[PDB]
Amino acid sequence: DIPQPIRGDKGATVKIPRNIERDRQNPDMLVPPETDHGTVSNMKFSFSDTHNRLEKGGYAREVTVRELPISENLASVNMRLKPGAIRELHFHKEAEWAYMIYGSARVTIVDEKGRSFIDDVGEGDLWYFPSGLPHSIQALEEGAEFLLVFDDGSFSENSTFQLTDWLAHTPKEVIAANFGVTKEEISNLPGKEKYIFENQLPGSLKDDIVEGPNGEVPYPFTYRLLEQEPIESEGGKVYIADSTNFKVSKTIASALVTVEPGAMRELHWHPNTHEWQYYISGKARMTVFASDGHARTFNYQAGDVGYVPFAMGHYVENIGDEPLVFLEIFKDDHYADVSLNQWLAMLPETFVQAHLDLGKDFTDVLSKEKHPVVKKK
Amino acid sequence: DIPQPIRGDKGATVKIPRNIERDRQNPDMLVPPETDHGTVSNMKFSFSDTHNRLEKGGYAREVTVRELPISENLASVNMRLKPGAIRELHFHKEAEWAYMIYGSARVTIVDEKGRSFIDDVGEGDLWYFPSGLPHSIQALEEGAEFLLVFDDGSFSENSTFQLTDWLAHTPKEVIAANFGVTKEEISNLPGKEKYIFENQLPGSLKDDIVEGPNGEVPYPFTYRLLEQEPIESEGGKVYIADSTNFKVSKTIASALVTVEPGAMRELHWHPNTHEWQYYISGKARMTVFASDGHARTFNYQAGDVGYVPFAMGHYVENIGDEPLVFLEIFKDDHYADVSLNQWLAMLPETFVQAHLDLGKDFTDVLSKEKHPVVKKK
Amino acid sequence: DIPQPIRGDKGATVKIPRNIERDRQNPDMLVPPETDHGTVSNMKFSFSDTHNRLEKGGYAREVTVRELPISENLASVNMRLKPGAIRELHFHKEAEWAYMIYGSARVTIVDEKGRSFIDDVGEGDLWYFPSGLPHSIQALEEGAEFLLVFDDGSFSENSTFQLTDWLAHTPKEVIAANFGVTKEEISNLPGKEKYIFENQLPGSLKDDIVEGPNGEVPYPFTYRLLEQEPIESEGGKVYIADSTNFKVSKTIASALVTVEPGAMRELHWHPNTHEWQYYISGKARMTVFASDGHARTFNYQAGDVGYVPFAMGHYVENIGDEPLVFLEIFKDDHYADVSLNQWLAMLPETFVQAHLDLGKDFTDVLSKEKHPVVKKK
Amino acid sequence: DIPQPIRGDKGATVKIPRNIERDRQNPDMLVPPETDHGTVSNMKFSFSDTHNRLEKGGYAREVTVRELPISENLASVNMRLKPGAIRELHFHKEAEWAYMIYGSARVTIVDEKGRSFIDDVGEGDLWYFPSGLPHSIQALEEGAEFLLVFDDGSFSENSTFQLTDWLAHTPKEVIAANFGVTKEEISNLPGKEKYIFENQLPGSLKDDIVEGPNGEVPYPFTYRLLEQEPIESEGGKVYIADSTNFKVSKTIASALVTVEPGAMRELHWHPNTHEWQYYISGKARMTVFASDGHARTFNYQAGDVGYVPFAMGHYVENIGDEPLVFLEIFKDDHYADVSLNQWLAMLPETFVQAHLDLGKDFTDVLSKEKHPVVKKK
Amino acid sequence: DIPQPIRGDKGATVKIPRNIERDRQNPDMLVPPETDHGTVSNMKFSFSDTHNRLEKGGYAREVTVRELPISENLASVNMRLKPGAIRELHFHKEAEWAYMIYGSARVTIVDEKGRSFIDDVGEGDLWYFPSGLPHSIQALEEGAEFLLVFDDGSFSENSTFQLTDWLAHTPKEVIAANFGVTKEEISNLPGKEKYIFENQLPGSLKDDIVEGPNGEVPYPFTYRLLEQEPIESEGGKVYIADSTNFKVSKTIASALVTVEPGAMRELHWHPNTHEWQYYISGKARMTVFASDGHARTFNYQAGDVGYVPFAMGHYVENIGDEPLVFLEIFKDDHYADVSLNQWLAMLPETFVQAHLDLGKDFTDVLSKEKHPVVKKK
Ligand SMILES: [Mn+2]
Ligand SMILES: [Mn+2]
Ligand SMILES: [Mn+2]
Ligand SMILES: [Mn+2]
Ligand SMILES: [Mn+2]
Ligand SMILES: [Mn+2]
Ligand SMILES: [Mn+2]
Ligand SMILES: [Mn+2]
Ligand SMILES: [Mn+2]
Ligand SMILES: [Mn+2]
């Protein structure tokens, strides 16, 4: 029907023209919990509310600090490639982390010692490209759609250093001298960037591997996240990839969280840095507790970016009928959380009772084992 | 049906879970014009995507620089009051401008010479409260819903100076000494703010007027915008209120624009300052031209805030079947625009022809008269 | 005796080594009102806690943004001159306002049209020197001690442009060419600044007046504040000097407030800008109400600087046996305040009653006339 | 010969590879006056050290805050147009001031009321375009070369809003609707900016004047600076144009200074704001006195930009055999200076003598009349 | 008697109302050394000049960047707890370092792997809590008073994340789901923070230790500083705790310095970072040498905070009859100093003589061994 911002004897009907569809998506913002209080920055933004760059071969859209100003340290691109299409050879100042949501793709990277890494990535796999190292993406026969995260919030995918753009803005006589060729031999170079372009599907990965005099890279730039054993608890699963297991991923730590219907990512905080979120599928709500009696609740669904500033308390509750699947992203060399339950469970029971004005019936339910996703009883 | 980010041979279908409802609201963002280019800051935000503060008597929600970071100089509150309900006597550093969308309300203000102004405001009326002067709002028998604009983007309606909050945080012995009463006589003062509270409807305006030894205020703090004669053109109407006619409104200039179906606010820019927008009803698109070959198109509908940074070129096209009604707001002492049509019409025809590579058939259609809203032929 | 931070059943004795003398000066900070709450910036600093620059002829010490960081827009110097001593001819970017606390002095200024103003200033008189105009101070037979206020908080009196410093760092051949003299004729110029130096007392003011071809300055740079009629109320007096009466004083508005024992500067705020304070004599306390349930109380006595950020609510209570005398300083072209009493007195009584949960016995005591200083009954 | 950084018994020969040509241009920087002292920001930059944008029809190069970081508030473009060539119709946020050094040009401007101003400007003439008003430049039969000054140091001439760029990034269907034409009628619009382009010479000015329903502009946007009577003194001339005589020029004040060989712009400072300089012809040196015993000397010649921060003491000495001609530019509504000579001349002689440790033989030479340019005797 | 700002033939008596008690505390500021010079930021602030938050169970007051703006990286709280009273379970972004001045207390901490550390701390002991890890303090039978230092100058103790505040602003249904309990079972949860609250004394430490499945923490969070062997020299003792011995203390390095009457902390500087100081007992003066001929002397006594910006030269002299005891605090992973004496002692004697214009009689007294506290002879 028609939701209204009314909670008991508080609030009133909306009397002006309104966005009913967005109101239906945001039930806990039109009607917040009575426990919310105070001014809190916006922690929510939809990729559907961004300009989509369309090219022959795919598209790209981004959520940056210009869209979500609380997220100064992290930005993200949703990129889509048709079968065989190429994201042009390029580099940038920022490190790049990726999660393959749909399909598969071949990536290349060459490091500062001239060593080559070429690999195929499928659904649930990651890559991480350190700052400044040059790379490319080419979708395979299913096409590909993936999430990129960059470790500077001011990033824009329109501002990468692309191979053909660099050459188009270098004097032809300098290019000729650089490679030992004539200007006539390079006369057919593109006059502008390609960025994303259609291409025939590549051959088998084994036939693309390039050998060289500098040997193999010491650590791989891809990771099979969903092939790892997750942390399993009553209501879902958590798969963690940070620099302790995905060795090259020095500036991005990540977790993929799945939350069954009727379950929730438990009350917790992160003692190391801010959390950046992407909602892959499902529907959620989250209250961010900001200290000094401040708290604000946000709604999220597929396509949304979320955020939790450093050490703010939070939970992520599935409020729908399907599994809730989201990413937790951190600009750090490791994942870390503190569980509210485990914290209190590891303290003397009478000390917790003195804080909460509750009795042994409550402290008896605390668990010294951390369960990141719990199920409603 | 199901829209897709495809434009001719560019783009592709979405393969990941997505927000179809938001995509349907943003057709020119999922599929932008081919004439868009480059990185442009976000210029669009919905009140439906904000936390609504619910109280006994109404609600308030806000769009600030924490939601829309391009808008550093202006912020806005959507406030609703039930019949008789009071927005508590308060003040703040920012000047406040208001447009009454629904219903009616009584306002009070007292200036720094102790002069009182009390007045009723109905649909289409404005008020403007200069910085720091204390005021209140009380809805009449229909209730009220209105848009507030404050001339600092960092404002928050949770941070005003309220009468009862001030008194609750002043020593009782100081309050007693201030007014010449005993502490017992003030023992029933509230212990916390009221902010918005239910109240019986007031009596007639004439019975509320307070006379005093300092006389009448020199200029009124309310304005009947829709009682003025608008600028009428083929496709709509523009009603302007700035410091040249609404004399007290020194830091906010405003225009209410109505655009018939099949019409558009013409191509123009503002030579004085940034534009802040509120979409009262209807559906629009706008391309913002940002210089250096950069342009980005945005979709808007009822409940949305928009923005155009200082001097960027723009138009506002009605893309729906109902009238499009929106506000243009400026932090300045006057409204000013330059019309692309009128500009070229006031130049030698051969000079315009040399720029545009078009002939007399085009310069013949230019108009030396400014028509802010034009109708498609 | 020995004060302790105990208020009823709250607080405890101090168990570590402590500053009992400062604790005795700050009773409302060691034991704040129970109505204080929350984090508020420091609003209090003593000239006695600053380095005093001693010279032959006097001294100078300063309180700047480096001492009191809330005061970004205003800084102050306490300067003392012995009889006849000269503060060297100099200029600076900042405008300068002054209050003569003790003694008397002769000032000079020359404007950008070459017009000269020379005048004597006594106790209770002011001067104001616009930005960049060059000036000097010479104490008369009693010596002089005065307060200077500069309209930039980053000012330092060690960084003025002094006549002899400029000449000492200009090539001698350029000085010679500038004035049409030989290098030998200027060989005795000082090699360094003088800043403050001893000198014989000057003659009568009438004998110093310099006539010139450009005529008299249009407005005087001195003002006899204490010769004006003050605003008198039950508990004290207020003398205001701003650009409406002290015409040249365009960027500094000022009030000298005297508060009898048992009286208080009433509850009020300023709707235009921040307040900077200097306590000339006596003892006070002030609570600053900072919005959102925040308030903090400060103690002041002779030699202290205070501050009230833009629009924060405040009062200034005399807590001693002698008159309390202080300055209110504003970076603006006029003085403005709103009185809490007068505000409520100019509203319908039942409307005030609905806010305060008090009856006609309270609204009957409100006054439509502003009384800046009230006396306890 | 070969200059060396040696001054008496100080300094030494240069032993590393060096730039002898630049050293010869900077004698007072390789060998500064012994009266210089301390760290002072760079105040000097050459247009010859900038990238020149070459187009069919002319060129443009710029000195901005990215070249000269002390100049945050002002930037400049040196622009050249061949006979008949057009600087494309455009606008920008910044106000624009211009001095015609060589040749002549026709300018157009249309204001926010649709009023047209078209005029020819010759050598020694100025124009001023207020913020955001659209304009164009077309050189006449001699071509034109001129200096532009913009009142924001972050300006870049590559970032203006150009007519054809705006249209190229606007949907064709929107352009068509805006003017009431078909998409086919506008199919020949340029696909990119023109910026500067060759064109046939225009006809007589009288034949270009466009009449309109909104009447004439109230104040002209051009000024004949060199037709005014200058301030004449022994060694040169000063022509001032600010908002008191060039009425539209509200944010830029200017003076053209000519200094004969053997003469100097006298010791002075500006009490209102920073000075920006352009050296049209000749050779100079200037010492900037920065307070606290700091001073640094700079050399300038044709093509150089200079700067003097707010209120710093300075002189400008001709150190060559030809006249020295330069511009003094200020971001303010008026020109103002204080003369060191006139300042001291308007004070009691014994008071000046007590400061300088000089006698009546020196104070006798002071002049109560201001002479901005003095001649060596 | 009555001190005056007179030094030989410089300075003068104070003629205006003044703070004699503060002047007596600041003899080297009312009458600085003649070797002081120039503008230097304030380096001194008293806890007695701060608002004291009083609660049932104790108090807390703070010195932050809002009080002492030079200290951007470090802030401090003086906290007092009555016997048995609890500082509520909480966490914050900042790391926390502590020195127990009086009494004793029990601390708890749980890390991000769920491991528990509980320990008692007495006079002269330290703790260090890494960023974001949750902790509590409970005073034992003597009560406790201690100094906290946080590694961000913008910290405020009013802004921690407290257990009961978080729960009070979390929906009850979410808390219930998180722990697997009913809303009725948690109905008695507090509605607001406790912060500090009275409580019965705890039992023996051994009975509070909580065992768990994740084992012991790898490094302890407490340190017995005064049980270590100090660096002993002629006039006092230095006890150092940094990350090389107090292993967890990664962002705070510390030294406790005791200076006998007639002794001084020698002339030295720190090559790694800024110094933050707390004066536990006694009376001192310190000159800070700031480069470029700038130096300023400050007085300190019990309860004062001091500061020395990165690498500035300094000494700390005992100017009283009792021992001087103070803390040196650094935001770094190690303590480092350079001794002026040891520096010169480790250079060729004739090279030092050429610098100082002194002979072998001076270089003969230099010591190659570092003596941090020397005694006057
Ligand atoms: Mn990339
Ligand atoms: Mn999390
Ligand atoms: Mn308001
Ligand atoms: Mn507009
Ligand atoms: Mn001065
Ligand atoms: Mn006040
Ligand atoms: Mn221009
Ligand atoms: Mn000048
Ligand atoms: Mn803590
Ligand atoms: Mn030290």
Numbering used by the authors:
A (entry chain A), B (entry chain A), C (entry chain A), D (entry chain A), E (entry chain A): 6 to 382
Paper lines:
In order to protect the quaternary structure, we used the aromatic amino acid phenylalanine, which we hypothesized would maintain a π-stacking interaction with the neighboring indole, while disrupting the hole-hopping chain due to its higher reduction potential. However, when one of the Trp residues is replaced by Phe (W96F and W274F), the hopping time grows by a factor of 4 to 6. We also find that the vertical ionization energy (VIE) for the F96/W274 dimer is 7.19 eV (VIE for the Y96/W274 and W96/W274 dimers are 7.09 eV and 6.94 eV, respectively), thus indicating a larger energy barrier for hole transfer from the C-terminal Mn to the F96/W274 dimer. Indeed, both W→F single mutants are significantly impaired, showing only approximately 10% to 20% of the WT activity in W96F and W274F, respectively. The experimental results indicate that both W→F single mutations reduce kcat by almost two orders of magnitude. X-ray crystallography was carried out on single crystals of the W96F and W96Y forms to determine the structure of the W mutant proteins. W96F and W96Y mutants share the wildtype tertiary structure. Significantly, the π-stacking of W274 with the substituted phenylalanine (W96F) and tyrosine (W96Y) aromatic ring system was conserved. The average distance of the aromatic planes within each dimer differed only marginally by ∼ 0.1 Å or less. We therefore conclude that the loss of activity for the phenylalanine mutants is not due to a disruption of the quaternary structure.
